[PDB]
Specification:
24 helices; 4 domains; binds adenosine-5'-diphosphate; chaperone; part of a larger assembly; binds phosphothiophosphoric acid-adenylate ester; alpha/beta; Rossmann fold; 5 chains
Chain lengths: 578, 116, 116, 562, 116
Amino acid sequence: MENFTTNLNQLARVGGIDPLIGREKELERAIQVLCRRRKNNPLLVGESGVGKTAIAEGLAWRIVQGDVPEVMADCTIYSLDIGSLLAGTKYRGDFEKRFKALLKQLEQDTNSILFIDEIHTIIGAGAASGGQVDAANLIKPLLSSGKIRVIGSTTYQEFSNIFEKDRALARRFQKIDITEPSIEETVQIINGLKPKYEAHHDVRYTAKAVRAAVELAVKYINDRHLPDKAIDVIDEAGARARLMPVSKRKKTVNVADIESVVARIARIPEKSVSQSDRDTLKNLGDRLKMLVFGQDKAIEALTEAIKMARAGLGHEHKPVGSFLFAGPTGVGKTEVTVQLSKALGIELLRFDMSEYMERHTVSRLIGAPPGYVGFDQGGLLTDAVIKHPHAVLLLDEIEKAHPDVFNILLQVMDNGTLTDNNGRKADFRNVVLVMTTNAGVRETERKSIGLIHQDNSTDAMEEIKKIFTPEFRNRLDNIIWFDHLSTDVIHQVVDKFIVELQVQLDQKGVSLEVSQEARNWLAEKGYDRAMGARPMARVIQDNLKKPLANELLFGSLVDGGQVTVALDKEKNELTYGF
Amino acid sequence: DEIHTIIGAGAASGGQVDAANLIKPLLSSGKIRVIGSTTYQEFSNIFEKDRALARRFQKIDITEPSIEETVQIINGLKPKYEAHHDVRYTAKAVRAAVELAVKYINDRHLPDKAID
Amino acid sequence: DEIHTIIGAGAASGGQVDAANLIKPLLSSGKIRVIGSTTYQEFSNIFEKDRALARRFQKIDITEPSIEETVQIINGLKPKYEAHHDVRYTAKAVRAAVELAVKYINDRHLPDKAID
Amino acid sequence: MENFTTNLNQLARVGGIDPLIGREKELERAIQVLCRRRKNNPLLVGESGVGKTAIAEGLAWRIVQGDVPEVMADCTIYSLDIGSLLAGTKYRGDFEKRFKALLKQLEQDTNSILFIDEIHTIIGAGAASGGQVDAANLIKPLLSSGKIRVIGSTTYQEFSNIFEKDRALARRFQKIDITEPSIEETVQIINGLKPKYEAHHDVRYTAKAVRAAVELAVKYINDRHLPDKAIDVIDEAGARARLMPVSKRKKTVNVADIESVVARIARIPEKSVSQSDRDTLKNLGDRLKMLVFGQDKAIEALTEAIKMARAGLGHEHKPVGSFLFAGPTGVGKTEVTVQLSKALGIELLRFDMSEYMERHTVSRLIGAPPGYVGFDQGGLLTDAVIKHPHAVLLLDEIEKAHPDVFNILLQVMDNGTLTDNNGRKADFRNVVLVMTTNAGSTDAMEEIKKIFTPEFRNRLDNIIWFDHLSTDVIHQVVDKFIVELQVQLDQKGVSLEVSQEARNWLAEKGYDRAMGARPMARVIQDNLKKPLANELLFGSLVDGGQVTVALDKEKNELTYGF
Amino acid sequence: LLRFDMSEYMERHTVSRLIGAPPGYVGFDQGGLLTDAVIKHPHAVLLLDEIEKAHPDVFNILLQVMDNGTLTDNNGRKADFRNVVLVMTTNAGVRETERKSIGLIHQDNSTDAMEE
Ligand SMILES: Nc1ncnc2c1ncn2[C@@H]1O[C@@H](COP(=O)(O)OP(=O)(O)OP(O)(O)=S)[C@H](O)[C@H]1O
Ligand SMILES: Nc1ncnc2c1ncn2[C@H]1O[C@H](COP(=O)(O)OP(=O)(O)O)[C@@H](O)[C@H]1O
Ligand SMILES: Nc1ncnc2c1ncn2[C@H]1O[C@H](COP(=O)(O)OP(=O)(O)O)[C@H](O)[C@H]1O
Ligand SMILES: Nc1ncnc2c1ncn2[C@H]1O[C@H](COP(=O)(O)OP(=O)(O)O)[C@H](O)[C@H]1O
């Protein structure tokens, strides 16, 4: 019945079917199966984008071409359109008659093989309500009787969902594994298809553009298989070249056009390297050194890792870098990470490890299981990374996390990817991972017994070593011990905090001038190298903010104006007029 | 819009096949062109499950605008609001709306937090 | 065969839809004897946990034959393949099919796969 | 109801239901409950296989016979098919519309009684999927105000999972305790059912066969309760006997056929359950002496103790015996124990007591208290003795265990049992306890005695002493090792003969007064098996080959070739 | 090559999943990780990384395999290890050969890692 089946040999005879490239063994295996005594129903199983249909059509083509032995040559090969059978829509029982009429006629033709694409839609006869709900059962008798030979086609999940469970299929069909082609096979396939794309887009491709589409898609696109992933790049490059100009220019597509296309598909960056921003890249060290004073070594470690990735001297299975920051409190560990994401113009993903102190909570990172209270919540980490693949990832207080988080971190550090409980994957290769810790802190507050105090920083390192075991430590790029703030740093910190105050006052119409002597006094009064910068913020709050707050509310400052601060001879602050 | 809602439109028999199935052959053949639209969650829980349609579309990520982009969008739109309400906004009022909305409202992104 | 598909309710629209209960009077009255057939996972999911079965059926553990038996099974069936494909097999070839099968077959066991 | 229930009076009037034997008390109580003006709903609570459902059928039979108070006249007990009632719903309005119809048909009959089999899944929960519902709330105001009186049936565990916790059901039913019957009661049940089994299989059972079926099942089959498992033994023996006539065998089913059946069910070597043991015992000491050379006194002392246990002169509340095996390393304490378990046809359980030196490991053997980490993993000792109740239990180096494990041992030796952290009993009455030690008699005593104070030593049946090896024995041990290799080589087509100077050397080298025969395994393997394995695999020595092993006087190497 | 990392099996909580013990894990119908691997790839080399970290119950199972070649799963399957090579990797005692002495020479030794 011509209403439901397409004669593929007829298509090959009047063209319609292209020659198959690189799957000659696959066709011979299918023929070998068709000529068997039992299970002579080959089933082609493979990944999306690898040519499963192309192979089935390729057989009809070879029959017509004359490359098939007399055992199967001149056999009619037909392709079944389920949508046609189920298009009748109306009248219960007519669906079953249409299905049967087709099968009876195919049985009668005898020297006929039926090809069913998407065979898994027959088994269970899906169509919301269904078929021909028993379409599988209606065909099974001819498969069991050895009367019809069916070439199937499906994928791996569906093979498992149905073919591995329904023994009436398991004992009738013979699975053939159809794999993705090689780089060279893909190029040959593209070149075979090529004129179709060139004709559609009125473009031409260079040999290099073809090779590049294959190599770049393989390097960066991980949700597809060859040849389609490369074909897709070729088609998009074609459209890009076609639509880009006003005048018929740049008709020939080159590698650079391919690079732009792959870069835009993966939401990655490209390859200038310093695209048009290598000149902002070179200044990270300074933009950060103006915000974090001291700790130059931490700034540099981060800065160099970023440049290496941009320079191409990286590793395509690793995070951009993996750092553990440690040191005395109040020294800028989290300060540096936050400013880095700003300096780079990217999103910061923050997780606070103290909230994940139970094994139950790793479900809040991977994603709640199908289905217990729901499951329609992916992992917090998985979704954050997919939405923002270039983010800086900051995990605070890592030593406070439940130990199972480390199994998760080691996986990410080892291969660059984490799989969600729903099967989706997060790509961490463009993500910078920084973890911070206070693991050795209790040691730096300890005092020695004696006349001369000792340096306890080596004890702090021993504590780190006993928490983060060698298998973890051996996967990091750097464990960086941040220093205590020197007096010179304190002076820079005081100015930083004064500026933040000046900015807040400006919104009230109040300007503020502080003398150098007043600053020197606050700097002397406000710090302890053992405490870090946090106490400096506190001295400013008591010496400058309190007096101002009273005036802003009841002080002459209620309407805006100017204040100054001077230090007097008693080292007291001398207040403002207005 | 809300393309994940086209799945299951027809329903409950008498073999009544629904939509987003009745359309597979037209997207597959290149006969028609469509534009889809989903949120990340809707497209992470419903839309993607029917792999056949997921394969016929190109996913384009629409990200949140920057602060300056938001200000510019508002300047472009403000004549609609001025006309509607018989008001005039100052230049400072627009920039303040964007900065304050970002600092204090954490429920939505830009430029909605500012337009509202 | 595949008795667990008869035991579960909802075997098919129409089915056998109520097969699960329709078989019970026969198992209970003894008018018709049943020999069933299933696998190990289905057995523990269906029979071990249901009084309807735990009070009606016995289990016989069916395991694979020996390597020598696999060869004899083929030799018993062998003439059919020789006739079907107009071929003859070397006794060593029969043994090789089995001896090599044990180095790569576990996707299904022997003899069915050595026969293939 | 026609397609949901079965009329048990209709079956009783025809056949179907066997009269019950000996459960008059359970039936009298069920009647008192049914006769109440309210909450006249008995709930039968038991174990599987104890007459739990048989009672409901038994009552329907009495009713058609008329052996009931007039109160019960004209009553009909309908059995509910839960699967029929629950299957085929899906939509939200279907369960009720079906259950509502079932009840009105039953309700119209004031003498109707509904029987729910295993009431612990059709009362919630249960699984609320599509069409609602796996519910009892729907009955709950019926058999509680009320007009319908349903006989329930469940098990002790399910009872406490639902009832008690849900008062909604707990107070609508009267609980009736159904306990497993005794040996005598089981025999009487069989005798009354027997005529139908004899007719079915064209067999006759002896009186002894019936008693044996009951007692052997109790001793060897630990999967099921008595009044049911004893029936399988009778019916299975009958079934084989029904097929036996193909070889012209006889109608009578004797004890031997019962024994074959029990051993088959329990997965025990044939007839090791009964009389193969008499010949084994006659030859037990002799067989052990063929594998262990020397230690003749030890083997004989052990053999005699075993025989009196087998003779039945021991105690029920004890292990079948408790022995301490004392002596030097490598003298066969372990080897005798291993061969003994094989000789007797039973499995061996082994524990290394050196792994239980620390205080927290004591709970490792029994199981942690509930709420403590790992309690749900169970113990190591008590599950082993539940799974394998007839095993040989060997405890190595019991002269190193933490003192608390000795309290575990004293309890076992004293009364035969331990309680698991899940409340289950580990029954040691059919196992034999062998403990080994390097303690040594006064000194051996003080070193073990230190924990095995008189309070412990009085619980041992004996002390078996294991002697040092003589020079003749070390030569015999080597001959055994060489022979095992000779057998493997014959199977591979190679003949091997080791010279006398080669045997003397290996015996002298592989024996150490401080390790006994233990080092022998490597001396033989490294000097003889290894060099030979290399040649055989290389193919210089092939099937049909012969090697003779001589010593090189200046090296003492084992030298041979072909 | 089959691989397992013993650092993931430092407690009974996860050991049962590796073993395939009938009780003790989710996904029991699929058996153990170990027993399935030995069925799919019966001739494989089995590598256990960082064995000194393994919980004692892992060791009880390894001893069972060493004694008779078989572990039994409760889904009607057995892990037959007679065709595999078992390799354990350790770092025991390595640290002790890098220990410093308490002498003016010092050097003293090269210790034996076998002690650990
Ligand atoms: N080198 C620095 N330059 C300027 N400000 C700094 C510097 N170091 C610390 N600060 C200030 O003190 C920091 C207080 O917050 P954090 O930086 O997160 O503290 P931390 O150093 O990360 O240590 P923790 O996380 O509180 S234990 C602020 O980042 C800064 O205002
Ligand atoms: N007559 C024997 N005496 C001692 N050991 C023997 C004898 N025959 C065999 N063996 C076995 O001796 C060693 C094991 O000894 P074992 O039973 O463990 O002694 P024990 O338990 O007293 O320490 C192995 O060489 C094995 O062959
Ligand atoms: N080796 C080949 N020779 C000829 N055409 C091929 C080959 N491989 C793939 N194809 C063709 O099939 C691919 C599409 O896959 P298809 O056969 O429809 O199965 P699926 O739907 O799973 O992706 C390519 O887009 C198309 O050009
Ligand atoms: N006292 C008895 N008199 C007659 N038959 C009995 C008696 N006790 C038990 N039976 C017989 O009926 C029983 C029916 O099963 P039963 O023990 O009541 O509950 P369940 O089906 O849950 O295991 C036994 O399987 C069977 O041997």
